[PDB]
Amino acid sequence: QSPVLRIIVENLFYPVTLDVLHQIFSKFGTVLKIITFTKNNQFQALLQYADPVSAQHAKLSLDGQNIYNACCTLRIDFSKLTSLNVKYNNDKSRDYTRPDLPSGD
Amino acid sequence: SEGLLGL
């Protein structure tokens, strides 16, 4: 069981920030790190919980759910990554356990 | 298609 989830937000008709993902996923556990990126022309993210069960719970509860009315559908799967490496704290990545990280470069 | 949060 992996504590890291791979997330794709489809039908992105309104901006979804890293902080909004933190808000939504924090309901199911302690979010340690989040990194967002664009691939295959889709907004995606990797999110790490402290507990693999929290990841499982979030996937069951949130997969296929819209973040906002009529848009921003979450597609969630487990990642084989056992943890995440975050270099910076900014709009694209965040390590909630390391407030000392630079925002870039 | 309701959402988790409001706008």
Residue numbers in the entry:
A (entry chain A): 180 to 284
B (entry chain C): 682 to 688
Q: What text does the study give?
A:
For PRI3, the four-residue sequence 3LGAP6 wraps around Tyr 247, whereas in PRI4 a different backbone conformation means that just three residues, 3LGL5, are in contact with the tyrosine. In contrast, PRI4 (core sequence: GLLGLGP) makes only three intermolecular hydrogen bonds. The loss of this internal interaction allows the peptide bond between Leu 3 and Gly 4 to flip with respect to PRI3, a conformational change that eliminates a hydrogen bond to RRM2 (from the carbonyl group of Gly 4), which likely reduces the affinity of this motif, although the peptide flip is also needed to allow the 3LGL5 sequence to wrap around Tyr 247. In contrast, there was a stronger 4-fold enhancement of binding when the double mutation Leu5Ala/Gly6Pro was used to convert the 3LGLGP7 sequence in PRI4 to the 3LGAPP7 found in our modified version of the high-affinity PRI3 and in PRI1.
The polypyrimidine tract-binding protein (PTB) is an important regulator of alternative splicing. PTB-regulated splicing of α-tropomyosin is enhanced by Raver1, a protein with four PTB-Raver1 interacting motifs (PRIs) that bind to the helical face of the second RNA recognition motif (RRM2) in PTB.
